[model samples]
Target: PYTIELIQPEDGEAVIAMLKTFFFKDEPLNTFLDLGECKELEKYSLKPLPDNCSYKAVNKKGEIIGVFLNGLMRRPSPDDVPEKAADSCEHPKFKKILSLMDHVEEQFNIFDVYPDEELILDGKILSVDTNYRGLGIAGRLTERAYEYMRENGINVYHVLCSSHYSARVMEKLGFHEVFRMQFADYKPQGEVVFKPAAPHVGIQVMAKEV
Candidate 1:
């Protein structure tokens, strides 16, 4: 049986390594942002929100197989875009992603639907090991997260899904689509920056009540 646990202090390195090996390593977005050259940007994506409400999926052998990374987004959480834009230019395209996030959030104003909370659980990233696919690991990880949020008095959940499959998972879990930006029309510098493979040509921000 798989066990889900809090992302403890000591588990940071292993978590990062596992995410890189499978999630970021194969992500089309990563292929665009880092051609194996953007170390700092890699750190930016790999390290965010510091897992305040994150969880790790572990196999029976005590191996970390998957991770659900989350961030605490208060109504006044420190600016993510400017901080990201002012970052090193080692990976410039990454800024494009952050800017897009800011744009989408404001464009939709999800709070108009979910309303503001002193604390909103930002379901930032979810990744499962390549070897442990289709076993409902993703479902189980989020289920565990839901229980934790309920225990902590957090009921608003939000996730920005870059991949279509991730969005589908949230949809299956009852998260509604609040905003979507088509990659074909997201011309950053008057030119499209991403043209991901079929059915993967957009970004979505999904929400739910935990």
Candidate 2:
């Protein structure tokens, strides 16, 4: 396994690019990158403190080709009906694209999950380039994340991902799926109903005791 290190946001670009490649390569989902938006959102964001958590990965010839960007945080947006309604939640992906996160508040509801009470790193975004997939990179990342959580005084481990394969990967790493749910399951009387979220063929909310 490659050594894991704690890195700053400045070290994220290459990893993000690798993530894009991995997403497009393995899954049908696609997302647009907005460097400016991500940069801005990151400004006031809270992540694993520099000394405790990490955003590191396996580097190949000086390039970070595999990554697992995560920290002990909360859900992204458990209740984002507005964005969900505006089609911002399109399957392929329709991020307000770093250009309009200000509108993210207006179009989404966060209080439903984050009501100023709990700090939850409820999810993770992990990827390995096609050339490196299944070389135990995924397991390595999970171990790194768990190791960080252990050192940081954190005990609750949670992750919400949209793929079943990833769900299994987490399971193998000692996590358990807590629940399987979606907005579609709550849709009302057929009002031209459409499931904006991707079909979670194997998507689930998983957790484990640290």
Candidate 3:
């Protein structure tokens, strides 16, 4: 059986090793900044996982087979609802580009949108350790994050995934697709030797209220 827990700074070395196993060196933000880039592949970069980022995963006999990372932040307040503009647009940019709704910069409590009263305080990010793909580790980690946020008053959770597989995982965990985009539809950042990360024509943005 496997178990999950927070990753401490002391666990940095182990986590870094786990990252290199699954992610192309460039796309793994921690590794790109820490281990230098991989020469064979173009970058598959994501936003930098903060030092304060919360991580959870399963370890079997001293080896981590699964993992997820999360970070808590502020969102719209509960009182702002029916205003609809309050936390109404989880992925603001995509929704705006798709013209799904009117855009507003108003903030609201994330719990109000998901109906998870427990999630009325913070927002976070989630990512899994890819080694144990066939297993249910992602869901388990997600539950841990949701439950943790609920207990601590975090009202919102947002997943920033560009892969189709990742989007499916989000939906399986009860997230909804709010926006999507095609990267080639936009200007390309000239990396000279390498290309920057961009969404595919089918890139999707999903959000989970709970």
Candidate 4:
């Protein structure tokens, strides 16, 4: 059995390490982007703590076996595009991946989905150890996130699901698909950029109101 708790700042390093081992390379988008092995986008999971925005699943031994990294953003606007997403990566592949995400977010105009000045809780990353798979750890982490959002007075929660597994997790949790983009259709220069492994054919934007 495992327990869920808000992530602590001190847990950032360990969480990054675990995610690198279990998620970074294996995540479908990264695979499609050809981001060869090692953790390239570690900072994405290092958002400031004490926001009560992310959670972890700990085992009976108190080891972090799973994680759901999250953050808040004002509803998307042309001026608020995630410019930083592409700046940190020197690799063209990494920049392309981030650019693709920014393009998707820009098109979403998520602000229109909610009221003025609404804060959007964006589920950034979810990872679990291979040994912990199939135990419902991910769903439990999402449940904790929902509770946190409700307490924080946030109503909309969205995720850019790059993996089919992640998309399915959101589906099972009652999130609706707001957008879907096939990888082949996202070519930048008349050439397919990402060819993620089987079972992961596209990216999906999903959201649920708490």
State how far residue 15 of model 3 sits from its true place (Å). 0.8
User: Model 1 segments beyond 4 Å from truth?
Assistant: 32-38, 45-51, 77-89
State how far residue 90 of model 3 sits from its true place (Å).
Answer: 30
> In model 4, which residue pairs have backbone atoms overlapping below 3 Å?
none
Give each model a TM-score.
0.85, 0.62, 0.58, 0.89
TM-score winner:
4
lDDT string for model 1 (1-210, tens) is: 889888876677787788778766665676556545445544654565355567899999998998888777666445634343433444566555666665666567655666556767777668888888888888887887788688889878888888787898889888988888888888756988777787786888888887
Checking candidate 1 for backbone clashes, the offending pairs are: none
**Poorly placed runs, candidate 4 (over 4 Å):** 37-40, 48-50, 76-84
Give the number of the best model, judged by lDDT: 4
Q: For each predicted model, how many residue pairs clash, with residues at least 3 apart or on different chains?
A: 0, 6, 15, 0
Clashes of 4: 0
| Candidate 2 segments whose C-alpha is farther than 4 A from its true place | 31-52, 74-92, 95-118, 182-202
Give each model's whole-structure lDDT: 0.74, 0.51, 0.49, 0.80
lDDT by residue for model 2 over 1-210, one digit each (tens)?
A: 455566575665555565445654454222322222232223212343343454556564666756666655544455733333234333222333221222333434333333552444444456677776777777776676667676666666667655566788789888886665443443333432223346445336667667
Tens digits of per-residue lDDT for model 3 on 45-132? Answer: 1222343445557567777665565555344454745443223334433222222112212222233455534423222334445556
Which is better, 3 or 4, measured by TM-score?
Answer: 4
Stretch of 10 with least lDDT, candidate 1: 80-89
By lDDT, the candidates rank as: 4, 1, 2, 3
